[model samples]
Target chain A: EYGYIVTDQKPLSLAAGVKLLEILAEHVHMSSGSFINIAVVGPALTFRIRSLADVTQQAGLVKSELEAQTGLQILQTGVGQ
Target chain B: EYGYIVTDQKPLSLAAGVKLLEILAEHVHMSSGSFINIAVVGPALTFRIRHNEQNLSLADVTQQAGLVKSELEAQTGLQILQTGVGQ
Candidate 1:
């Protein structure tokens, strides 16, 4: 719960989305994702460690919600690495 | 006579103006330029490509734009900050 942060700077072009997802996918399962899926119920990606749902907007801004949830600053979120 | 490339996709919002200028300067004696001055003399940033000008034109900059943008993207991973031959 306190070991994560994900962002949704969506509407990235298909190429950008794929590349970002490809890079992010290397963790958790990388337990991360991207915008390629934003077309349907998209703009926010989903990862699985069971589940995580704070579905919000923008990058770094998630830190506030993170601080609320975990109480860390410059929170230590990484892809299990 | 062939040691540089400069571009002027002017009308860039001022922030983008300074940043791109800031980056380009790190190279070339760090000699380069930007579009923040466009509103004054208007568009097409005149790179201080000194002691060297035979009436430069859009065609010149347009060709140069492609050369550096592609290479810059390769070297720096930045997006095509601006594109095409003006509008």
Candidate 2:
């Protein structure tokens, strides 16, 4: 149990959610296996994945579309989570 | 069994390495427990913590924060090698 990811509150489907998933798939593929863990617990939709402190705001841009494409609602657990 | 954190290569020692720990301590205090797992492995020096999908960058964001960086570098005397990117 060591991870945290913040995601949007939507499912992974799009007019081109297809294209989006591909990009995400590619990203996960290129990164590492099991490196990313997306989980939505209870009705709260919390994300118990992983996080680091210097990931930057770039996530803010990719998140808008990416979160929905992944179907995981990332919860901000801590200042870092 | 799920977590990953990338850290800087430095020990948690400030000019006095004092305030750094305090800052880090406060942040950790604010966050939930067990939410972060900082692990350093191998000669390459990798921080195996937790990771997620929405967190686009897995290098330095939430986990690899300020305090974590210094202590690691000083003790381990290393830098963050994000290249490993292993599962």
Candidate 3:
């Protein structure tokens, strides 16, 4: 599992949420209908991706998007089985 | 045990998720740090609420589960894909 946590000082809009998911869907080649839950915990949105390979590139994509977006910052990025 | 299944056609927002948890905490009599896991199952969100009391029958648990499901759905306007109680 590859995890990316994003912390926003302000509440994120639905469009922002959709955009984040869109990034994942594009970069990560997930199994068909694989369970993907991006639960909002506290000030952060935790994205857990169970992909077949390393997510460094996808993580970069997310970071770039977060950097481009307003009021959103990268809190943490990690990888584990 | 009580359970809830809310389908997330669109990604659920933090505010809505927080509100859902608040309602669950109140109804389930949960204090701080109680274990509540709401994860996306397919395109739906499923969670189970366990009761430690041995006195409560399945009927009571089922009724409580139904009430909670209804309240959550009504308050959030999120449709519950399904609802059930199990040991």
Candidate 4:
């Protein structure tokens, strides 16, 4: 099983989650890792993937979850470059 | 009074009065919401009920902590994951 670590700190908002995940995804991609799984255990949000491309998709998942749970629409900047 | 938000871009290390608590034995179930109550106003750390599980049992708590002090040790490694560069 692939080892992973998480922080106790909760993202203040959906936007925060997106921002944090972006940095994580970038880190994995830069490290040449095939995939990364980020599971928000508190809010019970899980983002699983088999590739870095899934990061963008998972970020969207987080955004959707945030909106559905908190009624907030998080804007995604074009940082995919 | 459970609402708490802290972000000063200063999670570089553990500061004074920094205490890390694990999910207490009394908190076996997932929804207990009981925490280890880390009091690091300047460089503190806190996880979610079940969102962020820290392996305090596997590591030692230190002051003036670093990225490894948090649960995302293996994730970030030597790099910093913040909103801006040089964070």
Candidate 5:
């Protein structure tokens, strides 16, 4: 089961989750902005993946979740090579 | 600037990250599951700092990193860089 806790130091905002996926996807050569079919249970962002590309879908879900919770803003730069 | 690119070969799942933390953290006695604020920038697991009961010294941490690096390289047959081009 592939998964990441992101972090538990604080509440994980949907916006944060969204950006996280974008950053992560970009690192693995997956496209940006698409977080789909992922489950954000409490503080965890959970999802099953058939391929790395699925991470993009999860990014969309995180953005959608964040908008529902609070607000939004454009992300900046990229991490990892 | 304290960072570790766990692996670029695959996606880093929480479970995998946890197992990884267990391996690395246990090496230096940092509590498990306490990756507080340690940024997982994509596939990279970046961090900064210590432990309670064991007051981790800079020299101590460096030594552990070196030992672990050597052990991992030997086991996996992959060169693990602890610093720049050197060892």
Candidate 6:
């Protein structure tokens, strides 16, 4: 009953999107009953989840999260999240 | 007045974006004095309008509507007249 939603439009490169998808897939495999859904609407994208616990766990693995985890900038985590 | 905004990002997802855009464009054509403005900032996107009655009419066609419609949401339709008509 856990899910991740990806919605964002910034003209990402195909390779970059694929790489992110791979990372997300791995995260999903590690988490039980976790799903990721990607929706592209014009130039806007939104990422959401039904399970806060699963989301919190995977938060660190996400690119935005990893940057924050490294403490490069505390503000990054605030905005990335 | 009514309007719509679109936002999303995915590589090679132009088709998806265009499909949604078409649906929205048709809606706009049918609406009276409605406008849609799009803004894409980094990975974040936002669409906003300043019309009320049009927005309410277009609400059902939107992908999602925020919580409850507030007075701000209706300012365009109601206030525009009030301000001009001295209501």
Worst 10 residues of 6 chain A by lDDT: A72-81
Per-residue lDDT tens digits for candidate 4, residues B1-87, read 011112333653443122222222223322223334423334323432223354422111111122223333332232222110000
> How displaced is residue A55 in candidate 1, in Å?
48
Per-residue accuracy of model 3 over A20-59 as CA lDDT, tens digit each: 5565565576542342665555544445554312343354
Computed on alpha carbons, the lDDT of every model, listed in order, comes to 0.32, 0.34, 0.47, 0.31, 0.43, 0.31
lDDT (0-100) at residue B28 of candidate 5?
A: 77
Task: Kindly indicate the candidate among 2 and 6 with the higher DockQ.
Answer: 2
- What value does the lDDT take at residue B30 in candidate 1? 35
Every candidate's fraction of true contacts kept comes to: 0.00, 0.04, 0.00, 0.00, 0.00, 0.00
Model 4 CA lDDT for position B73? 30
Q: Over 4 Å off in model 4, which ranges?
A: A1-11, A30-45, A51-81, B1-87
Candidate 2 chain A weakest ten by summed lDDT: A43-52
Please say which candidate is ahead in lDDT: 5 or 6.
5
Off by over 4 Å in 6: A1-9, A13-15, A28-36, A41-53, A61-81, B1-87
State the fnat of model 2.
0.04
- Evaluated on chain B only, candidate 4 has a TM-score of 0.21
User: Which candidate wins on DockQ?
Assistant: 2
Kindly give the stretch of ten consecutive residues in candidate 5 chain A with the minimal lDDT sum: A72-81
Give the TM-score (vs. native) of candidate 4.
0.21
Candidate 3: residue A29 lDDT (0-100): 64
Pairs with steric clashes in candidate 1: A27-A30, A38-A42, A38-A43, B27-B30, B28-B31
Model 1 collision count = 5
Query: Residue A67 of model 6: what lDDT?
Result: 33
